Amino acid sequence: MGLYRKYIEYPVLQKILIGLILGAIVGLILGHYGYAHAVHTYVKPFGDLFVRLLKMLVMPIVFASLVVGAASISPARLGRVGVKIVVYYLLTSAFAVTLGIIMARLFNPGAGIHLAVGGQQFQPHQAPPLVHILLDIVPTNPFGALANGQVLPTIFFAIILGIAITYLMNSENEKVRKSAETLLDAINGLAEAMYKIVNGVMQYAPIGVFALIAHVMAHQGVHVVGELAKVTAAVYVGLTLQILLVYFVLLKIYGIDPISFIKHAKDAMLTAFVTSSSSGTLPVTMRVAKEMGISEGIYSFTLPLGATINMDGTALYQGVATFFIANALGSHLTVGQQLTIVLTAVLASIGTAGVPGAGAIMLAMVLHSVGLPLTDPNVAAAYACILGIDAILDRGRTMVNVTGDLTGTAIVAKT
């Protein structure tokens, strides 16, 4: 087990990029000499196992995290400035998703791939009338939603359970109060346990990323590499313009000087960029918070709230991916479908945990709203090719999310 210990003790982020570049070389070299059936039958199953691993823990982590999160939060009317706090992030998320559509049309990623994994192109199914969709949010059986795999009914049932369980903790009866604590602790244990499994799966990602990239290179060929570069470059330039478009303009109109703003915050983004974990990068956020030389009481609630609420960078990733998959599958997005992208993506960005890899887990939830379920083999193939390239894209989107946190707290502080 000498080599096993060395392999584990290494930056997980570095290995994925090492695994990604190695996979690309192997696929093209093999593809030039043929052996298309060789990779399809020998190295493909490693990629499929990684896909099944991610889908395993999506359901248990959605239910447990919401119950713990909803119970902890209590309605305090947000005082006076809090209503100004929550409204700020909601509007900004809409802008980020809206910018994704125009930039995606500018480059048009996913053209000329022609997925035929299932033997035929994906055929959209007509959506049921909106009355049936809304009435299905309420689960007729709370246990049925979990077992059958429905996600929307589970979210509704999880939220109300957390709200109902925080009243018992405040109840005067001792037996009722004690029973509420035990039930909350058991679910909190399940949510914590699901996070340790996330680290275990990420250690298998370099092997999983290697298998997925190699399989795609051999079949599609060198052509598919070009589009993968287009989506790679698109997100960064879209994020780059977004920072100047909305984050800079608020600084200019108000009295805070943007040039000095980044000078004190320069260490903040750089530390987050290296670690690529916005939720875990909290200590530096409070570090710069206490050395701004201003009030701390505003910082008592803004940073914990803005940890999960603000996720502009991931939001652009969610929107661009949703559009990219449609082009690969050959199904054009109508105007009506584009309207539900921003509504779904913005609320989706709210539920993101913040740890790296969370966007991949909840990207599929937006796909269900569009009408592209994961059970479709054609959708699975296109979605799998994104899972390989997530690490390099996740390097940039963390910086935007943390920057929006730091920028947003300062402008309200000026008021």
Ligand X SMILES: N[C@@H](CC(=O)O)C(=O)O
Q: Compare residues 376 and 394 and give the one whose CB is closer to ligand X.
A: 394
3-state secondary structure string, the chain?
CHHHHHHHCCCHHHHHHHHHHHHHHHHHHHHHCCCHHHHHHHCHHHHHHHHHHHHHCHHHHHHHHHHHHHHHCCCCCCCCCHHHHHHHHHHHHHHHHHHHHHHHHHHCCCCCCCCCCCCCCCCCCCCCCHHHHHHCCCCCCHHHHHHHCCCHHHHHHHHHHHHHHHHHHCCCCHHHHHHHHHHHHHHHHHHHHHHHHHHHHHHHHHHHHHHHHHHHHHHHCCHHHHHHHHHHHHHHHHHHHHHHHHHHHHHHHCCCCHHHHHHHHHHHHHHHHHHCCCCCCHHHHHHHHHCCCCCCCCHHHHHHHHHHHCCHHHHHHHHHHHHHHHHHHCCCCCHHHHHHHHHHHHHHHHHCCCCCCHHHHHHHHHHHHHCCCCCCHHHHHHHHHHHHCHHHHHHHHHHHHHHHHHHHHHHHHHC
Binding of Na ion by 308 (CB under 5 A): yes
Instruction: Give the nearest distance from C-beta 360 to ligand X in angstroms.
Output: 7
Instruction: Kindly indicate which of the ranges 234-242, 290-298, 336-344, 355-363 contains the residues binding ligand X, using the contact rule CB under 6 A.
Output: 355-363
Which of 149, 166, 124 has its CA nearest to residue 60?
Answer: 149
Binding of ligand X by 354 (CB under 6 A): yes
Binding of ligand X by 23 (CB under 6 A): no
Instruction: Give the nearest distance from C-beta 389 to ligand X in angstroms.
Output: 13
Q: Site residues for Na ion, window 84-113 (CB under 5 A)? A: 89, 92-93
Site string for Na ion, 355-394 (x = CB under 5 A): ----------------------------------------
- Which residue number places its CB atom closest to Na ion? 352
One of 92, 210, 397, 406 touching ligand X (CB under 6 A): 397
Residue 285 binds which entry of ligand X, Na ion, none, with Cβ cut-offs from 5 to 8 Å by kind?
A: none
Instruction: Kindly indicate which of the ranges 170-178, 190-198, 203-211, 396-404 contains the residues binding ligand X, using the contact rule CB under 6 A.
Output: 396-404
Which conformational region is residue 50 in: left (phi greater than 0), alpha (psi within -120 to 50 degrees), or beta? alpha
Binding of Na ion by 405 (CB under 5 A): yes
Residue 308 binds which entry of ligand X, Na ion, none, with Cβ cut-offs from 5 to 8 Å by kind?
A: Na ion
Binding of ligand X by 314 (CB under 6 A): yes
Site string for ligand X, 251-290 (x = CB under 6 A): -------------------------x-x------------
Binding of Na ion by 398 (CB under 5 A): no
Taking the C-alpha atoms of residue 89 and residue 350, their distance in angstroms, rounded to an integer, is: 10
By CB under 6 A, the count of residues binding ligand X is 14
Q: Site residues for ligand X, window 119-178 (CB under 6 A)? A: none
Instruction: Kindly indicate which of the ranges 70-78, 166-174, 249-257, 352-360 contains the residues binding ligand X, using the contact rule CB under 6 A.
Output: 352-360
The pair of structure tokens assigned to 20 is 């990604």
The pair of structure tokens assigned to 243 is 């920072």
Taking the C-alpha atoms of residue 373 and residue 284, their distance in angstroms, rounded to an integer, is: 39
Instruction: Give the nearest distance from C-beta 306 to Na ion in angstroms.
Output: 6
Binding of Na ion by 65 (CB under 5 A): no
Instruction: Give the nearest distance from C-beta 189 to ligand X in angstroms.
Output: 24
Binding of ligand X by 238 (CB under 6 A): no
Per the CB < 8 A criterion, the answer to whether 284 and 271 are in contact is yes
Instruction: Give the nearest distance from C-beta 311 to Na ion in angstroms.
Output: 4
Q: Site residues for Na ion, window 313-352 (CB under 5 A)? A: 352
Taking the C-alpha atoms of residue 66 and residue 161, their distance in angstroms, rounded to an integer, is: 9
Backbone torsions φ then ψ of 35, nearest 5 degrees: 55, 35
Q: Compare residues 93 and 398 and give the one whose CB is closer to ligand X.
A: 398
Binding of ligand X by 19 (CB under 6 A): no
Q: Compare residues 99 and 224 and give the one whose CB is closer to Na ion.
A: 99
- Which residue number places its CB atom closest to ligand X? 359
Instruction: Give the nearest distance from C-beta 120 to ligand X in angstroms.
Output: 33
- Tokens 């058991």 correspond to 186
Q: Compare residues 82 and 351 and give the one whose CB is closer to ligand X.
A: 351
Binding of ligand X by 357 (CB under 6 A): yes
Residues that bind ligand X (CB under 6 A): 276, 278, 313-314, 352, 354, 356-359, 394, 397-398, 401
Residues that bind Na ion (CB under 5 A): 89, 92-93, 278, 308, 310-312, 352, 401, 405
